[PDB]
């Protein structure tokens, strides 16, 4: 029955969950591919000959030669109009032996509303104001009169969700049916709701647990923890939030790296130092099995061997036997090495 | 690694939660009790002499001989009124080698403001009305100016709370210290916010993953998850929701007992049959190792025994290894049985 | 052939037997109960809802799922009107397919005469003055000319028993049919006619072979002796008797529990500390294949913890191989438990 | 433990106890004899050389050449004068190095009074009027004042049995250091106060259960039960009592004999035609391994053979494997056949 393979980011993320997903898609093949995304932020993968994927909606994984079934948990919160663009881009590989099936308690965002409604905390707390918390605290009201907000709900007066839009039932034989399975987290462990940072966090915990809650996923189907990290942790840009004791920010001058900015608000991501208090902390609540270490273009190989070190000591102290068998060196599938070949 | 037992409800809510933790933690001597329960439950144990415990704030496992620690979780929305209360009438349990740690996120509900903001869902979905998801709300809202939600902030001018309330590292540490845990489920799994009777639910999920999560318990952590029953099913009072399709309501009078009433609403409850659709839901999604079959009391022995077999049935065909390893037959730590004693 | 099952008292009577045999009725469900019980013993059991029985005739076995047969031995001395009271009350229990058995030879107590004269052993020798010796007597005269004290000749005349009085055949083969047997004895070890406190005992020897003597069952038909022991043992009040050289006299108080009535008298109980002596003896004479450790409420875990092991090493010391198996906790069936699930 | 070879009789009494008792004692040399006799009767051994024993109180089996201990147990009933003339006339085998133990309990007979009590039901019943149960009576009443019938307070002022009157301890810890023991029964089983011809019968059971207890022998230590039979039984003259259906009432004439009487009282013996239903009953309680068929003499060769043969059929129609092992041709010794030898 173990047959879920999660990926996780263990730092505040953007950390390559995208591009990891993709590569792990491609070699593994798996046939379901699941996710609970919210509009905070869009994942990227570029494939081998420069085919590029940016998703909010859809999981990354739809390049796995063997897909067979698309799942969106009963935690995502989405954009119709976002879901058909993405859908419409992937026509090739959604084809007629793809089933695509949304959980029927799945948020849709009401664009209009939910954004301006996170105005005031896209200043205050860095957030990014898509409108995420604000459509969640609309399906927790519960008012039996509001038919607008779940997606079995929104299905009955728009037809673009109704063929995806499935029953309870249908999710966990799906499910069930699955023969190997990748599901994709979300956002980063240290930019959960429940730790250190609050309220400078989002809006739900970024841990194995309550991805697997959102997704729907019985525990003892869980395979493999795969966990993301970055040489240098980035956060995303103003007045996001604080860092941990052993770290420092930096500029992208001292890398000798130009700015990176988010793709649609084009806020400077703001850049820090390797922290080790954050890995012993991602280590103890997420214990991957298996870790992806990105961003490693930005060293020398000294400094990023260093690290990989660091890591998998961080691992042993809160009693994880987390392997770094991943490095990234840039933002394609061609740049994801075995690290038992580079070092 | 593996030394969490973990206590949930297979139906919807008040089966025997309280007894079966106040059980376990006799027999078994957990050091460490943990939570994370919101005002709309109530939990009740009775032990061999007669005392009895009610609790809607601390774990019901307080009886545990070799008590050292009481947690309540991230996910806690509770009274300060109610928890020192309950302090006090187990002041004797709760002595100076007793450290009582109630995470820096655990919500502090504002009974007047959450109460009144959930006025309307009491009468429309049959909720308990007690503010459980208008103060879960104002935590998610994050702004930087509120002070007053979440304990970390409450602690700095309300000083009942604040030696308790402790820092993220001395939660993980604690848990790391920790030689076993009894940690408790509550609501019940088909009042999960993702299970098919929204809006007719509860603000959460009830399902073993999102437990650990509201409790930040890493998933390796996990041991054995025991499951808890009812021969007829309860709902509250109220147009509370609908039943499954092969379950019909019955009335206290069929049943030939005194009508039950509602833990914190002194309301009437809602009776059905046993459903085995209920169960292979449940078992499915939160796959119990132990199952506890509680109020066998309200059948003869052949009614259920068949019970405990169909249990067994529904679990088997979930690929759940469950087995129900106790039964009830009344309301105190004496009227739990080993099922290998009497069939 | 080995079917009977044997409840006997280690002591100096009231530790139990009551309950144990109703417990054990409940559990094994005996097709056949019987006893040879006198007017200065009274019995209690209190089943799981609370229903309870106080009886100076009829077997506490009665309870039995599978009651086919209730037998009252040779060896009985009965008040009519206590055993007409004992009947109605159990009615429902004792319904058109139970048979009552009355040996012939049975002894019928004539209240006044009985009663007076005892008067003046019940002040010397602390005797219950229930008028069982003098009835004994009476039985043992065998004038001829006597009508009035054996049932066979009482049933001539009275016709409140004449239905269940039958005949040595009808009684042998009873016994003979019996698929499986409870048999009740009654007072204890060490009121014994033949045992060291002589006057200050009873009118017969309280031992396996006098049991099984006065309810005519035949050797080869025993199976396992139940030997019942308290860990404070008890005497009625008044000048009793004596004690054993190793055990002192205690008060209830020092006990810190409300003063104990004796059964049929409404008078205080006389208490002791455990004897290793009276144990050894017990042992060595009634050789128990099963021990009932009863009032262990009385004592801490370590207190009645070490008891256990006293009995089980004064056991082996007189060649009896007697296991501990049950521990009580509590007047009713709930407090009975096994002693492989609490040590 | 099981060391006990146990002698009793299945039918009414004088059918040869003593003679099997003293040749088992002859061919298996027992270190213990033991017994608890009434003055009911004497029991006669005569051996091979032609010295006669005729004993009321002491064992016929002190004839044994590894004799060690000589016990008279707590059910005894005795005339010191008669115990000191026993004694004296076996003195050559009770010396000093063979211990008698009188047990603290056994009752001393007043020859005067009690006597004189049973004088009325030595006519009415035809009882022998030795004073057996006025002794009995005298010790069931308990008086505290009464320092004049158990032996343990006669030695206090009779020094004729002080030096064999033990403690209870004492009578325990012999039993114990026993290596081998003959226990002798008395009277016979359809003369049990419980049998069906009551008041016709003597003061006690005379079945194998009862023998054990008033001799203190714990249930465990019964190794073989060897009951005795006549041809012809016999009843003790005059207004006795009843007989069984298939039995019918005969003359000494009849069977060619002298007619015989008792040995003090010179009552002629009624003598009876074998029952096959008083040997149905005998084998049902007294359940003998072996049988000792006896006064074969009075009969020819298919007359005891038939017989024989009818005893084995009872005994299997009661569950009972008694196979006859002795068949006696005489008084004496010489005159005990084994069965396998003469059919
Ligand atoms: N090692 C790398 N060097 C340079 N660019 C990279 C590398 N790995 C990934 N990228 C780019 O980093 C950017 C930031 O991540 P973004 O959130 O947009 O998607 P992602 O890489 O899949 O990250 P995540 O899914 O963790 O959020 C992406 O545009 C991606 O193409
Ligand atoms: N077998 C039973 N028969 C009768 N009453 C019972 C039985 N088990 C529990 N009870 C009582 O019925 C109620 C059912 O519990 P509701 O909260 O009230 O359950 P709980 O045991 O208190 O805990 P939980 O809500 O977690 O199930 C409680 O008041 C409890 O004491
Ligand atoms: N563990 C116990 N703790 C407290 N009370 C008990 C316990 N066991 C029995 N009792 C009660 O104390 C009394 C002791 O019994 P006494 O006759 O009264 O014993 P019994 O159980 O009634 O039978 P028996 O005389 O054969 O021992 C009874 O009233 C009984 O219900
Ligand atoms: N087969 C026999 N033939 C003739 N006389 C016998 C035979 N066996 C025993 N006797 C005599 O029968 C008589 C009657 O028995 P009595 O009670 O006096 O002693 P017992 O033979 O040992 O009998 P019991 O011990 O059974 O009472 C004795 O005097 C005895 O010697
Ligand atoms: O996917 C993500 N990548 C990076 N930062 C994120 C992501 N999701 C949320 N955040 C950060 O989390 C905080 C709150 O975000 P919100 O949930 O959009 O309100 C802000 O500081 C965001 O920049
Ligand atoms: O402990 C509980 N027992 C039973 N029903 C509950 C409990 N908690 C919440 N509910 C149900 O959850 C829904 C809303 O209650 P609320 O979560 O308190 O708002 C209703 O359908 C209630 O009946
Ligand atoms: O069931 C009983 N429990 C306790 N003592 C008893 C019981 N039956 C008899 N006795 C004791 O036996 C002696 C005489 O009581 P009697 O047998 O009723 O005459 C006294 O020492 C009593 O205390
Ligand atoms: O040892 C015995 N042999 C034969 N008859 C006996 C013996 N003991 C008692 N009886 C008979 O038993 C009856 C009652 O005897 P009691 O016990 O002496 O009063 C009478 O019919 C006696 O003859
Ligand atoms: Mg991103
Ligand atoms: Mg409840
Ligand atoms: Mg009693
Ligand atoms: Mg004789």
Chains 1, 2, 3, 4 share one sequence.
Not at 14 to 24: E, F, P, Q, R, V
Not at 33 to 51: D, K, L, Q, S
Not at 164 to 181: G, K, N, P, Q
Request: charged share 20%; net charge negative; hydrophobic share 40%.
């Amino acid at each position: 029955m173990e047959n879920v393979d999660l990926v996780i980011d263990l730092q505040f993320g953007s950390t390559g969950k995208g591009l990891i997903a993709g590569y792990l898609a491609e070699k593994n093949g798996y046939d379901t591919v699941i996710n609970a995304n919210m509009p905070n932020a869009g994942h990227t993968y570029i494939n081998a000959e420069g085919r590029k994927w940016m998703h909010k909606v859809l999981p990354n994984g739809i390049v796995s030669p063997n897909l067979k079934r698309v799942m969106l948990g009963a935690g995502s919160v989405f954009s119709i109009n976002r879901l058909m663009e993405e859908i419409e881009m992937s026509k090739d590989l959604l084809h007629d032996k793809v089933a695509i099936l949304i959980h029927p308690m799945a948020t849709v965002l009401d664009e209009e509303a939910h954004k301006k409604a996170e105005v005031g905390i896209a200043t205050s707390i860095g957030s990014t104001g898509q409108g995420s918390m604000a459509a969640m605290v609309e399906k927790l009201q519960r008012d039996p009169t509001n038919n607008t907000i779940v997606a079995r709900d929104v299905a009955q007066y728009d037809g673009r969700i109704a063929q995806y839009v499935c029953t309870v039932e249908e999710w966990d034989m799906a499910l069930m049916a699955s023969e190997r399975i990748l599901a994709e987290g979300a956002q980063g462990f240290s930019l959960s709701l429940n730790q250190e940072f609050y309220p400078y966090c989002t809006s739900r915990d970024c841990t194995p647990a309550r991805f697997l809650a959102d997704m729907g996923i019985p525990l003892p189907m869980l395979n493999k923890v795969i966990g993301t990290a970055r040489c240098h942790p980035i956060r995303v840009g103003g007045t996001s939030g604080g860092h941990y004791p052993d770290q420092e920010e930096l500029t992208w001058e001292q890398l000798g790296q130009v700015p990176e900015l988010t793709t649609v608000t084009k806020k400077v991501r703001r850049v820090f130092s390797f922290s080790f208090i954050q890995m012993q902390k991602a280590m103890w609540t997420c214990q991957p099995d298996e870790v992806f270490l990105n961003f490693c273009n930005y060293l020398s190989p000294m400094g990023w061997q260093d690290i990989v070190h660091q890591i998998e000591v961080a691992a042993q102290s809160r009693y994880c036997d987390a392997e770094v068998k991943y490095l990234g060196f840039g933002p394609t599938f061609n740049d994801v090495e075995l690290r038992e070949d580079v070092m």
